[PDB]
């Protein structure tokens, strides 16, 4: 069927620097992050430490219900929503919808490492077109290590 793409820790570090650069071009350094769990956790960890951001919020998604919706402090105006891949785009669109409804005065930008060209909804910042089959080091490294 489809060929097997893999995203390593070293590629993640290189791309994260480029992601930082592109986010700063579009909205400056964010004042807070919303991590889409689980996919965005490692990325948002690295980004929040790089930008010295202590305001890091989480949000979950499942025909979609968005769960654990954060309540962002009033003085935070520029928020970056972070996920690792946008496939159909349905989850990210729903996440941004509930976040902006709840906080109409704030500006939410979205960033993803990978982005399907066919997605109905695209992140404001993304680095790479998503192939049909790609796995990530946070998914596969532990078990190959356990297998050895």
Task: List contacts with a copy of itself (CB under 8 A).
Answer: 9, 13-14, 16-17, 35, 37-38, 41-42, 44-46, 48-50, 54, 56-58, 60, 62, 68, 70-71, 138-139, 141-143, 145-146
Instruction: Answer with the entry of ligand WG7, a copy of itself, none that 28 interacts with (C-beta below 5 to 8 A by kind).
Output: none
Q: Which residues are near ligand WG7 by CB under 6 A? A: 39, 85-92, 133-134, 136
65 binds, among ligand WG7, a copy of itself, none (CB under 5 to 8 A by kind): none
With helix as H, strand as E and coil as C, how does 71-89 read?
CCCCCCCEEEEEEEEECCC
| CA 128 vs CA 7, 15, 82, 123, 147: distances in Å | 11, 9, 15, 11, 30
The residue to which tokens 């060209």 are assigned: 117
Q: Say which entry of a copy of itself, ligand WG7, none residue 7 contacts (CB below 5 to 8 A, set by partner kind).
A: none
Helix, strand, coil shares of the chain as percentages rounded to 5? Answer: 35, 30, 35
C-beta of 78: minimal distance to ligand WG7 in Å? 23
CB of 12 to a copy of itself, least distance (A): 9
Whole-number Å distance between alpha carbons of 27 and 24 = 5
- Count of alpha carbons within 13 angstroms of residue 121, beta-carbon side: 14
CB of 142 to a copy of itself, least distance (A): 5
């Amino acid at each position: 069927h489809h060929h097997h793409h893999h995203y390593s820790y070293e590629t993640f570090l290189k791309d994260s620097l480029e992601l930082v650069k592109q986010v700063e071009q579009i909205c400056g350094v964010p004042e807070a992050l919303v991590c889409v769990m689980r996919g965005g956790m490692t990325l948002t960890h690295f980004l929040s430490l790089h930008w010295d951001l202590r305001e890091v919020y989480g949000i979950n998604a499942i025909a979609l219900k968005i769960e654990n919706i954060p309540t962002i402090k009033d003085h935070l105006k520029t928020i970056l929503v972070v996920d690792e891949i946008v496939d159909s785009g349905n989850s990210l669109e729903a996440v941004l919808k509930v976040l902006q409804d709840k906080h109409p005065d704030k500006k939410f930008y979205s960033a993803s490492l990978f982005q399907k060209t066919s997605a109905k909804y695209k992140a404001d910042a993304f680095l790479k077109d998503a192939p049909e089959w790609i796995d990530f080091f946070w998914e596969v490294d532990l078990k190959n290590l356990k297998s050895h």
